[model samples]
Target chain A: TQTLGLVVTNTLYHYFSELLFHAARMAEEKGRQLLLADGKHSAEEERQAIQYLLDLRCDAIMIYPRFLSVDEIDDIIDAHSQPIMVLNRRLRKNSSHSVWCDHKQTSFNAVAELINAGHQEIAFLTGSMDSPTSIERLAGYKDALAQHGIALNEKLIANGKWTPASGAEGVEMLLERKFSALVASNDDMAIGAMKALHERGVAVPEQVSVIGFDDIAIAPYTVPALSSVKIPVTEMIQEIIGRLIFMLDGGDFSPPKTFSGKLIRRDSLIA
Target chain B: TQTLGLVVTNTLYHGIYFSELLFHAARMAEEKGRQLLLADGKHSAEEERQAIQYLLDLRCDAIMIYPRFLSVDEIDDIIDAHSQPIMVLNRRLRKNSSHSVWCDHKQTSFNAVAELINAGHQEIAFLTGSMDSPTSIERLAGYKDALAQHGIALNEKLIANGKWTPASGAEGVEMLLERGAKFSALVASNDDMAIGAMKALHERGVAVPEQVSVIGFDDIAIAPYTVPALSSVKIPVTEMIQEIIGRLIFMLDGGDFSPPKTFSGKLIRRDSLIAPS
Candidate 1:
C-alpha cells in the first residue's frame, strides 16, 4: 500500500490547504497512495499528527507546518529517519529539507508593477508584527524601493489587522504620509483599502492605485476590480510532492527552492 | 487499504468545475476512512469508460463519476456488467443499475427562467456552454419548459453560444444584439457567463436590472460582489457530495439501492434582477 502520509492545517478552503489535496491527488497518479491528517492550527495538534504519522509509518511524510515551534519541528526531523519534507513555510536557519516559494519575489513582482506605473511614494500594509509573511513582504517592498532609487519613508508602513477594516485603516493612516499607492499583504486588506478609498471619493487608478496578493476568487469582483499578485502555490505543491517522492526512493536532500509570482492586471492599477 | 475511486472532468482552476465537487468528495472519503484513486477523463467518452474500468481493475470497491462524455446507453452497459456499484455524480443515468445523485440542473434552469418570466420580461436571451453536453441540454430544455409555461413564444435569435467564459458571454450578447433581438432579460448557464454578460452590458452603457435583468447558475463566490451583485441559482454541492459518499459506504455495507434524488436549486435574489423597467 504505497500510502504517503501528509500532516497539514485543518482549514480546508484556503488556497494553500486546497493545494495539499491537489499535491496528494497528483501523487496517486504515479501509483503513490496518500493519507491526510489535519493539524488544526495548533502546535499540540501538530505534535499529535507527527506522532500519528510515526505510528502509521507510511512510506514518507510531508508537513504543512502551522503552529509547530522550531524545537518541535527539529524534533519532527530528529524523530524521523525517513524522508520528512516541510512545505510552504521557511525555517529560521534555512534547512535543506523544506520547500517554499520565494516570498520576496512575490512581493517584488507585485510592487514592481506599481513602480513601473510611475508611483514613487508607495506605502505597504502589513499583517501582525511577527508574521513571517509580513516580514518577507516588507523586505521585498524596501528592496524594490531601493532598486528604483526611492528613499523609504518610515511613516509609509502601517501594521494592519489583516481585515478589510484594517486595510481601510491602513489606507487612512498612510494618507497622512501622502503616499501615491498602496500594497497590501493579501486580497482582503487590498479590498478594504479600495472600499475605503471609494467612500473617500478617491478614484482608483486615477488618484491612488492599489495592488493585492493571493488573487482570491473575489479579487476581480471588487468595485473597481482588484489588481493582484497570484502566488504559484499549485506549482510549489507539485514541486514539493515531486521532491518528497524522490526522498521516499532514497534520493539525497537538496537545498530549498523558490518560485516566482504572476501579476494579474485588472482595473485597480493604471498608468 | 480501502481505495475509493473518483472519475471526473480534467478541467482546473475554474470556479464552477467538477474539481470543486471532487475536493469535497475526497474530504468525505478521508473522513469515512478510505484511500482514493482519482482518475481524470480528458472529457472523452472512451477515456471515461477506460477510467471506470481502470478503477475496477485496481479493485476499488466503488467509483464516483462525472459523466462528461459517456452516453446513458454506455453507462447502463457498464452498470449491468460490473459487480461493484457505480455512483454517478451530478448526472442521471436513465434506466440504469447504477445509483445517481443529481444536482437538478434542469430544475435550477427552469427556476431561473421562471424568475425572469415572473418579473414581466417576455423577451429573454439564453447563453449556453454547449449544445451537446447533457448539462446544456437540460438547461435548454428547462428554458423551453419555462417559456411554454409562461405562454411566451420562443425567439430563436435570442440564444447564443458561450463556452462558460466571460469573453464568450460578451460575444453571446453582442451576437444577440446584432440579430436585432429585443430582450429585457438574459439567463447565462453559469456565473462566469453571467459576469461576462454584465461586462458587455456595462461597456454599452446598459444598466443592469434597470435595462436588462440577468440570472446565472452555480452561485460562485464572486457572484455577490459583482458591480451590481448577480442573482444566481445555488446548487447544493456539499450535500450532494456527502450523500454520494454515504451511498457508496452504505452499498459497501450491503445496503439495498435507493431511488435517485434530484436536489432543488434555490433562487438567490440579488441586485442583478428587478421588475423590468
Candidate 2:
C-alpha cells in the first residue's frame, strides 16, 4: 500500500493538531497510510522532516510551514521528485501547488463586524509582526478601517507572541488609549484580553466589544461566549489531499485555491 | 540511521495529550540519534495489530505502543513472539515480563475526587471515557474508591459516559441534568471533556466554582485561559516519555531488563475548584 506524508511546524498547536486529525482520517478513507513529521517550528527542522518523509519514499507530501522562505521552498519543489502540496499558504512560484484560507478577508469581516456595530476606535491585537498570517490579518483590519472612513490609530494596535500572557499585556497597553472594540489574531489572545478586562471590571459587549479568529473548541464556553471567525480547516484539508492524490495518479497539477472563513456572532460582540 | 516505531490508538484521541506525547517522543528519539516512525491504529483492534505489523515490516530496531483495543493476554503473546524489543506505554502486560511505562490513572482520579470531598462536596459527578479503554477503567475504579472511602454512595445516574471529546462531554452533562442527578462537583476523564462540560454548565446558567466545581485530568494548554482558570491533574508526560525512550534504547544495546515504572500526576489548583456556596 502507498503512504502519504505530512510535515507540520508543531503538532502541539491546536490548529495543526486539528489539521493532522482530519488529514489522517481522510488518508485512511482514501486507502492510504498517513505518516507525520513534526517541524518543531524551525526551518531547519522542517527541511529535515521533509527529507525524512522522502527517505521513506512517500508517494506524496504535504506541508504546513511556519519558517521557510518562498525562495527556499521553490528550490525544494524543483528538486523533489514526489508531488508536494503546501497547506494554508500561498506560494509565488507557479510550479508550486498551494491551498489556503483567506486570512485577510476573514480578518476584514471580523473587524467590519465591530465597525458596523457603531464602534469607531477599534483595537487590533496582532501575533508576531514577522509572520505572514499576522501581516495579512493586520492588513484586513486596516482595509476595514479604510473602507469605513475610520482613521487607523497606531496606538490602538499591539503586538503579541500568539500567547495568552502577551494578549493580556497587549490589552494593558491598549487600555491607555480609547477603543470601544477589540479584535485579536486568534482565540487564545482574545481569551486573554477578556481575562484582563474582567480583572479591570470592564464589561464585554457592554463597555467594549471583542472578536477573535480560529473559533476554537472552547470558544462557546467562555463566560460571555466569544465571537470569532471559523476557518474552513476541514474543507481545506480535503482539497489539498484530493488534489495531491490526483497528481500522484498522473493527473494535471491543479491551480492554487483559497477558501473563506465564516464569521460566528456570539455574546462577545455588542448586540 | 536506525529507526524506532510508535503506534497510537488515534492521533486525535486525547487532543493535546497525544500531540504532546508524539512531539516529545520524536524529539527524544532524535536526541539519542534515532529516527522515529509513527502509525495510527484508527481505533480498531485489528487495525492496531496491522499497524504493529507495518512497523515490524519496516525493520524498526524497537517499537513502543499506546494500545487502546488489544487485550493484556494478546499483548503478552506479541511480546513473547517478537524478537525485537517491545515497550508498551500506558498499559501493563500480564503473564509476560515486558517493559512498560505508565502513569497511575486510578490513583490520580482518587486524589482529585478526594480533593473535592475535602472541599465539602459529597455529591460529585463523574465523566468517564470509553469503558473499553483500560485508562478509563482504572480512572472509574479510583473514583469509586474515593467515594467509598468518604462513605458517599455511588449514584449511577451521575456517571456520564464520554468518548474523550468536547461534544461527548457536553452530552454527558446534559444527560446528567436530564436524569435529574444533583451534584456540586464534576471529575472529567480528560481536559477536552472537562471544557465541554463547562460549556454545558454555562448554557444551563450554572456558575462554576460557585454552584458547581469542576476538576479535569491532563492540564492542556488552554486550561489556564478558560474564563475561570481550570483546576487539573498535570501528568508527567515528558518525564514518562524520557524514561521510556531511555529504557528502550538501553534494551536495544543488550542491557538487562528493568522493573515496570509508573509515574504519578500532580493536581493543579485554580479558580475552577472551590467549596460549594
Candidate 3:
C-alpha cells in the first residue's frame, strides 16, 4: 500500500493540529496511509523526523518546519530521490517545492482595516521574536502604519508567548499607553486581551477595537464574537496534498504557491 | 530502526481535532529514536482490526491501541495471539494479563461531584456521554457513589445523555429543564458539553456561580476563555502516555509485562463554580 509521511515542528498549537487533522483526512480519502512525526520545535529533531520518514521509504513526504534553514532543506531536496514538499514556508533553492500563506500581506490587510476605521494609536501584540511567523506579521503591522503615515511608537508593542495568559499580561503592560486598537498574533491571545479589557470595564469595539490572526474554530463563539484573519487551512491543505499526489504519479515538479488570508469582520471590530 | 505503531479509534474528541494523546505519544517515540506509525480506526471494530493487521504487516516492534469499539475479550484475544508487545490504552483487559494504561475516570468524576456537594449543592445535574462507553459508565458510577456517600438520593430525571458535543450538552440541559428537574449545579462529562450547558443557562437568564454552578472534565484549551471561564478536571495525559511508552519499549527488549497503570485527574477551579446563593 502507498504511504505518505508528514513532519511538523509541534502540534500543541491549534493551527498545526488542524493542519495535521486535515492532512490525515485527505490522505485517508485518497486511500493512502499517513505517518506523522513531531520535531518538538528543534532543528535537530526536524532532521531526525525527516530521516525517519526517508528511512521508511514513504512515497512522498510533507514538512511543516519551524527551525530548519533554507540551505538544509535544499540539501535534503537535493539528496533525496523521493518527493519532498515544504509546507508553510518558501525555500530559496528548491522554491518550486513549497506552499505557504502570505502572513505579511494578511497582517497588512488586518492592520490597514484598523487604520481605515480611524484608529491610529494601535497596539501590536507579537508572539515572540524568535518565530518567523511573528516577524512577518510584525513587518506587516509596520507596513500598514508607514503607509498610513503614522509614526512607529516602541511603547505600543508588547511580546506574548502565544498563550492566553501572556496575551492578558501583554495588555496589562500596554494599558498605560494610548491605543484605540489592538492586533494579536493569534486568536488565543486576542481572546485573553478581550478578557483583560472586560475585567477593566473597557468596552470592546467602542473604546478599543481588537482583531486576531488565524480565525480558529472558537472565534465566532467568543463574547461579542471575534474579528480575525481567516487562514484557509482546508483549502491550502487540499492544494498541497493534490500537488503531492501529482508528483507521486510521475507528474512534473510544480511551482511554489502562496494563499492569502481574508479579514473576517465580526462584532469585535468597530465599523 | 525500531518502530512503534499506534491505533486510535478517532483523532477528534470533544470539539478538538487531532488528539493531544497522539502528539505526546509521537514526541516520546521520537525522543527515543523510534518511529511512530499511526492508524485511524474510523470508529469501527472492523476498521480497527484492519489497522492492527496493517501495522503488524509493517513489522512494528510494538503496538499501542486506544480502541473505541473493540470488546475487552476481543482485545485480550489479540494480545494473546500477538508475539510482539501489544499495549492497550484507556482500557483494562478482563484476564488482567495484558499491559494497559488509563485514567481513574470514576474516582475523578466522584471528586468533581463531591466538590459540588461541598459547595452546598444537593440537586446536582449530570451530563453523560454514550452509556455504552466504559469511560462513561465509570464516570456515571462515580457520580452515583459521590451522591450515595453524601446521603443524597439518586434523581434519575436529573441525568441526561449526549454524544459528547457542545450542542448535545445544550440539548441535555434543555431536556432536564423540561422535565422540571431541580438542580443548583451541573457536572458534564466533558468541557465542550459544559460550555454548551452554560450557554443554555445564559439564554434562560440564569447567572452562573450565583444561580447555578457548572463543572466539566478534560479542561480543554478553550475552557479558560469561556464566558466567566470554566472549572474542569485536568487529565494527566502526559504522565500516562510516558508510562505507556516506557513500559512498551521495555517489553520490546524482552522484559516482563508490567501491570496496568492508572493516573488521576486534577480539579481546576475557575469562575464557573461557587456556592449557590
Candidate 4:
C-alpha cells in the first residue's frame, strides 16, 4: 500500500543512515512499515530500485543525492510516479524535496571562527572542485580573507578528491609550502592532513590550526578532536522523511522544506 | 602558460602505480623545460595534492575512488569515456572520462551463455535491467553472440527485464504472459533478479527445474556468495584498476561532470540454470 525507500549506496555510513533508522522506529509506533533500498551508489541502481518501489505501488521514496540523470528523472516523473524527495542538495528547478545546511554560510562560520582565534595565512585543502559545498567553502575562505584584508595566494589552496589519501597528499603540499594553518574539505581529509603534519613533527594549534567539516565518528578520536562543521544529518533526514510520511498519509502536499544547520566547534583550532 | 594537471583520486594498490617511473619521466620532460603539475597522494597534506576528485571538467579530469566513489591514480591514458573498454565494466555510461577499474562483463556473461548454449536449449530466457547500463548491455551482447554462434535465432519473446533485482525479475515474470513470452530456460540479468525470480516462481508453484531453468549474474558479497550459492558474475577489479589509467587527468579543474565508472564483472555459475526438461 504505502512505503518509503532509503537508498544507501555500497556501505552505509552513520551520517547517511541516522534518519531512516530513526524514522523506521517512529513508523513502528504508528504500526506502519517504511521501505528502504540501496542504490549501491549508482544511478542505474537507484533507477532500478525506484522502478520496483513504484511498481510495488509505494506512495513515497526519499534518497540522498537523487542519483539519476535528467532524462531518466523525467521518465520517473512522467510515469506519474509517486512523490520523490532528495536530501543534502537541492534538486533542479522545483524537482524534489531537500534539506541541507547553507554550506557557504557554514564556511564563513568556520573560517570566521578560525580568524577570531587569530590565525592568518591558513591553507585550505578542498574536495572536488565541482562540488557546490567545496566551492562555497572556498568562497567563504575568500570572503573571510577579504574581510581581514589578506591577499589570496594560489599556493595556499590545493584540491582533494575527498579521500584520506588525497588529504594526506594535500597536507604534504602544505608542509612543503610551510603554512601554519590548514582547513580540509571534510573530517576525513582533515584527519589525513593532520597525520601528515604530525609526521613532519608539527603540533596542532601549537604552530598551526587544523579544521574540518562533517564531524564523522572518527573526528573525536583523531590526535585532536577535529574542529568542524556538524550538519544535522539525521535531524534533517527526519525532517524530510516526516514531511514525506505526512504526504504519504494522504496529507496535503506542503511547500518544499529545507533544514538550516549550524557548526559544531571543537578542539582542532587555536590562536 | 601551457600547463596540464595530473590529479590522482585515491590510493594506488602496490602494483597499480609505477610512480617511481612517473617521477623519472617527469624529470626527463622537465629537461626540455616542460611544465606539468603532477599531484601525488599524501596523508594530511593539502598543499601538493587534493583528495577529492573532479570528473567531467571540460579540460578533462579522471580520479580514483577512495570511498569507492572516484577511481583514483589508476588511469594512464584518456579514453572514449563514453565507451566501455575491453574487460572494463564502466558501470553507468554518461562518459565524462575514465579508465575501468573492474572486470569484463561480456566475458562473465559469455562463460554462462556458452554453458547454456552447450546444454542445447532451443529457447533461452534473457533480461538486462537498467536499459542503457553498459554492464547490462554488454553482458546481453555477449549472450546474444553465443546464440548467434550456435545458429539459434534470438527470440525477442524470451527476453525479459530483470533490472538487476529480485523484484524486477518477479515483475518481469509476472508480466511474461502479457508479453506472450516462452522460454524453457531463463538466464536472469543478475543474481538479485534471479533470486527475485525464484520467489516469483515459487509463489506461482512453478518448479525451477521441472518447468523452467534459471541462471543469475553477479555473485554479490552476501546472499549470493553464501546461502543460495548464487550462480553469478565475478568482477576482476584488482588488475584492471591496477594497470589501466583513466583518460581524464583534470583533477584540479572545476566543472559539472558525470560519474566516470569502470564496470567489470565475470560469470560465476551456480545452481540456477539447468538443462531443458
Real interface contacts reproduced by model 1, as a fraction: 0.05
Better of 2 and 3 by DockQ: 2
TM-score of 3: 0.89
Better of 3 and 4 by DockQ: 3
TM agreement with the true structure for every prediction = 0.73, 0.92, 0.89, 0.46
* Residues A94-138 of candidate 4: C-alpha lDDT, one tens digit per residue: 344555667777787777777777777889998878566779888
For candidate 1, write residues B1-277 as lDDT tens digits.
5667777654432223554565666677667766555554544688679778866766779988777778877887788888897878766777763488876678778888987887788989999876657777788889988998999998778889778767678788878878987889999988878888887787777889899999988877556546677899887888787888888988887887887766778879898999888
**Ranking of predictions according to TM-score:** 2, 3, 1, 4
Overall local distance difference test of candidate 2: 0.83
> How far does residue B186 in candidate 3 sit from its true spot (Å)?
2.5
Q: What share of the true interface contacts does each candidate keep?
A: 0.05, 0.39, 0.25, 0.00
**Model 3 misplacement above 4 A:** A10-14, A40-45, A78-81, A93-96, A249-257, B14-19, B30-33, B96-98, B128-182
Residue pairs whose backbone atoms clash in candidate 1: none
Model 1 chain B poorest 10 in a row by lDDT: B10-19
Weakest lDDT window of 10 consecutive positions for candidate 4 chain B: B9-18
Ranking by lDDT, best first?
2, 3, 1, 4
DockQ comparisons of all candidates to the true complex = 0.16, 0.45, 0.32, 0.02
Identify the runs in model 4 with alpha carbons over 4 angstroms from their true place. Answer: A7-14, A17-31, A37-48, A66-81, A92-96, B1-277
| lDDT-best of 1 and 2 | 2
Query: lDDT of each model, Cα atoms only?
Result: 0.75, 0.83, 0.82, 0.56
Q: Which structure is stronger by lDDT: 3 or 4?
A: 3
Best to worst by DockQ, what's the order? 2, 3, 1, 4
lDDT for residue A157 in candidate 4, whole number 0-100: 93
Q: Of the candidates shown, which would achieve the greatest TM-score relative to the real structure?
A: 2
